[PDB]
């Protein structure tokens, strides 16, 4: 059963969680090819592992920048979790290491680019197209939540398309293993649950609210709560009044009403029957959950490819040195990494 699959996955996870892999490679084992994305502590690059010729995505964080941004514990969360998970729609760590200046995490490369890019270009996804992605997220969250993990940054920018048109949920920077409630103000304005905005203790139900935002955005082409400044976005979210495009099917609206529910006692994914209230909603009635998990379903969109390290599905970013100081920075802070 699902319960059986998940208990076994938890046994697997905890072994790695309690005894994390550390220092399993070094920088010069990799050829750096291109920056695929950037962020507050550095970037993610396409790299080639020389010994195998395999391509990977290497995330590089500047330790000093992590420290300035007060993201030390969050970064340690990211690495410790990613080395420990294993799931079809996640990119676990193949390798990690650090040097005087940086932290390095090496993961499976998803060559299809960000969902964000395709969603914006095309405008919006059909309900079947949105459902294919949504199913994969539902399953990932099922997996993650069973391990007492909250993800906390679902959005198109953070969903990578693979060669088969399936998803990888990347960007574990805010992911946290927590039983019960937590309090950090984090996430992305458009996707923040009202509990977060109202500075309450919250739980994994914030991820299910964020799923409502994503499905809405995929199907509409814009999010349910938007405005030029975050404060105005927060005011809309806490009203919770959502308006649906006329093209939204009856079932879709009903799903979204139950995901984008300000009342935690009624929010889908947070009820006594957990994720099954979502899995068994009418909008997903055509979804074969096992076949999605097995990647047997035919993806509604498959990315245009030229080669194994072709990068044409990514935007171009300015390439910046990877500099390594002769002095070790922030040794204590990142000792366990």
């Amino acid at each position: 059963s699902v319960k059986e699959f998940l208990a076994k996955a938890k046994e697997d996870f905890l072994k790695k969680w309690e005894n994390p892999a550390q220092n399993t490679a070094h920088l010069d084992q990799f050829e750096r090819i291109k920056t695929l994305g950037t962020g507050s502590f550095g970037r993610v690059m396409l790299v080639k592992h020389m010994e195998t010729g395999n391509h990977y995505a290497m995330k590089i964080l500047d330790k000093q920048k992590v420290v300035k941004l007060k993201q030390i514990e969050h970064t340690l969360n990211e690495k410790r979790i990613l080395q420990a998970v294993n799931f079809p729609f996640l990119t676990k760590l193949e390798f990690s290491f650090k040097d005087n200046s940086n932290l390095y995490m090496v993961m499976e490369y998803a060559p299809g680019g960000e969902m964000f890019s395709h969603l914006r270009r095309i405008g919006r996804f059909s309900e079947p197209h949105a459902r294919f992605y949504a199913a994969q997220i539902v399953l990932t969250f099922e997996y993650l939540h069973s391990l007492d993990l909250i993800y906390r940054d679902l959005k198109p920018e953070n969903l990578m398309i693979d060669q088969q048109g399936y998803i990888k949920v990347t960007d574990f920077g805010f992911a946290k293993r927590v039983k019960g409630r937590t309090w950090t103000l984090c996430g992305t304005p458009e996707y923040l649950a009202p509990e977060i905005i109202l500075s309450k203790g919250y739980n994994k139900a914030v991820d299910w609210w964020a799923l409502g935002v994503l499905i809405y955005e995929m199907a509409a082409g814009y999010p349910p709560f938007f405005a030029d400044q975050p404060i105005q976005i927060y005011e809309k979210i806490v009203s919770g009044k959502v308006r649906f495009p006329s093209h939204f099917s009856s079932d879709l609206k009903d799903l979204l009403r139950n995901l984008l529910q300000v009342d935690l006692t009624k929010r889908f994914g947070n009820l006594k029957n957990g994720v099954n209230d979502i899995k068994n909603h009418k909008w997903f009635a055509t979804t074969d959950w096992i076949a999605i998990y097995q990647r047997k379903v035919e993806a509604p969109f498959i990315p245009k490819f030229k080669g194994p390290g072709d990068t044409s599905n990514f935007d171009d970013y300015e390439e910046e040195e990877i500099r390594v100081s002769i002095n070790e920075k922030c040794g204590k802070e990142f000792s366990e990494f």
Binding site: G123, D153, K155, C186, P189, Y222, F226, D228
Partner: peptide, 20 residues
């Protein structure tokens, strides 16, 4: 239209995370 309001907004690009 809502689509037109979105595309004219400053939030159609990649959206940054917030923290504390």
């Amino acid at each position: 239209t809502t689509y037109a309001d979105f595309i004219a907004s400053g939030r159609t690009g990649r959206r940054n995370a917030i923290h504390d």
